[PDB]
Design a protein around this ligand. Structure first.
Ligand SMILES: O=C(Cc1cccc(Cl)c1)Nc1ncn2ccccc12
Ligand SMILES: O=C(Cc1cccc(Cl)c1)Nc1ncn2ccccc12
Lengths: 304, 304
């Protein structure tokens, strides 16, 4: 019992973190096999960030300008290429600690763990989600770029995020491991506003199922609703519309608790309309949306 | 910017997790040098837990009855001893992944990371705190016993907690790595109630400083208070009394923000008396007390 914002164990990812320095800029890189992946803005000076032409800036860079250090030993760079917004630095040594891995591009609403790093060294691990506006609410300081987001399935690490930028609003933007930004963001120091940060409805429902499983049941009511009726309320409260795909994904949680998905929707509807009235659910005074249905089952069943 | 419930990177601790089986019970063990530490209730059957005499139960156990597996390879047990509520299983092989370590006994209000494990394999990592009633609000299922709590200072892991038990109220009790329970709990299946779970005032103040540093400033008021006046309010709201030792520990956060500790106390006093009025601080609708002043500085400065 108990329900925590839990991150994946970070060991497999810690073994991949390296420091990348180009000119006077230093950030993190991810060393998998004989390649080091890092944000391409490592080639920029702070002045360059205003309007950078990465292709032109890269012409002035050779393999020996990319300093890659793994722990306290230097890696030899034998090739470099730019793929979208990331640089791939080919090194002469395969990372002996390379775990089984995949590069995945996640959808909004999906959660992942972040291993925040500075100078190629891990500072901490936390759980977050790809927001519906394609930002992440992380915790990142200057030098954290190149830190990655990932999920783990037994022994395979699926890398889904590489940190690139903080928007003026303190939210974060980044790419998948192919260098494509999530959302419309560009690696340029230009004020870019994020869209509406809507609530991930299916995740709130999963968290409500987690609460019932862990004993918090005060919010369960005698009502039911329909997808269309629920969605009228979700629109009013800036929640994502719930689809039958979402209802299907909540099937195992519905089966575990004996609470039909539409009945849980009716509980959520009353919580949206009435508020919590000073009460809490799983130690929270707001509706939590950064646990997916898969996360709830995983935590409540102890997958290792 | 951004402020997250952040755990330490768990790699150094993942390298120490092993499975311990005795009879039909299986739990986790912590392998440091040539010793494996685990809860002594590994020798009990589910029936034994009602009223166990551990010394008597241990007489029927020999080295070969303790099955210790590290990954997929078996460790040879060459000695066993009971120290308070933990067993120390001497093995014939030193753990090659033993990090620099210390065993510490923490005080209530102090935070640590937990690497939840099942069958000697890590499932996840989360941050928690030793509550003032000496319980922890963790996330643990059957088989999670032996999972540990720890802090890290650069390359040294300070182990502070080993999970032993869930109370009927869904909160958790455990020992330090010398086998002494935190609080009055005993490793016996007897209903043991926890005392008042008071709020860790100094941690709430640290989190309010973190909020100001990260831009959330709506709660700052034009008032000040005294330690005695503040403490009258803290008593009323089941908050721990604030001492000059706490004020001293908040000095660096006070200096960083230019907000005198007693002025921040007056902001906290108004938040206690008036509530949040539907507003949030650092994405929370309640006052968070599981970040110490050291945690806030560490996260806001990027210590690796
Ligand atoms: O934002 C950047 C780097 C950057 C700057 C301009 C454009 C791009 Cl593409 C990238 N890093 C970052 N992440 C969290 N942070 C918190 C405080 C300061 C910086 C910072
Ligand atoms: O409580 C125990 C084991 C135990 C039982 C009785 C006395 C002692 Cl000393 C220890 N493990 C545990 N921790 C979280 N859990 C969640 C669901 C079931 C069990 C469980």
């Amino acid at each position: 019992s108990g329900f925590r914002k839990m991150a994946f164990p970070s060991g497999k990812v810690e073994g991949c973190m390296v420091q990348v320095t180009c000119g006077t800029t230093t950030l993190n890189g991810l060393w998998l096999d004989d390649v080091v992946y890092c944000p391409r803005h490592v080639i920029c000076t702070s002045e360059d960030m205003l309007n950078p032409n990465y292709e032109d800036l890269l012409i002035r860079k050779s393999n020996h300008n990319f300093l890659v250090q793994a722990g306290n030993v230097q890696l030899r760079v034998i090739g470099h290429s730019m793929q979208n917004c990331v640089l791939k630095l080919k090194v002469d040594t395969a990372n002996p600690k390379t775990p089984k891995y995949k590069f995945v591009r996640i959808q909004p609403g999906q959660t992942f763990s972040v291993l925040a790093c500075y100078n190629g060294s891990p500072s901490g691990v936390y759980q977050c989600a790809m927001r519906p506006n394609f930002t992440i609410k992380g915790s990142f300081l200057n030098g954290s770029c190149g830190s990655v987001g990932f999920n783990i399935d037994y022994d395979c690490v699926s890398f889904c995020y590489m940190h690139h930028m903080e928007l003026p609003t303190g939210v974060h933007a980044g790419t998948d491991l192919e260098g494509n930004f999530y959302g419309p963001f560009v690696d340029r120091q230009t004020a870019q506003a994020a869209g509406t940060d809507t609530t991930i409805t299916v995740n709130v429902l999963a968290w409500l199922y987690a609460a019932v499983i862990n004993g918090d049941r005060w919010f369960l009511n005698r009502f039911t609703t329909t997808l269309n009726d629920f969605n009228l309320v979700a629109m009013k409260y800036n929640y994502e519309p719930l689809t039958q795909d979402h209802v299907d994904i909540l099937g195992p949680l519905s089966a575990q608790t004996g609470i039909a998905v539409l009945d849980m929707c009716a509980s959520l509807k009353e919580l949206l309309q009435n508020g919590m009235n000073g009460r809490t659910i799983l130690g929270s005074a707001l509706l939590e949306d950064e646990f997916t249905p898969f996360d709830v089952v995983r935590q409540c069943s102890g997958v290792t």
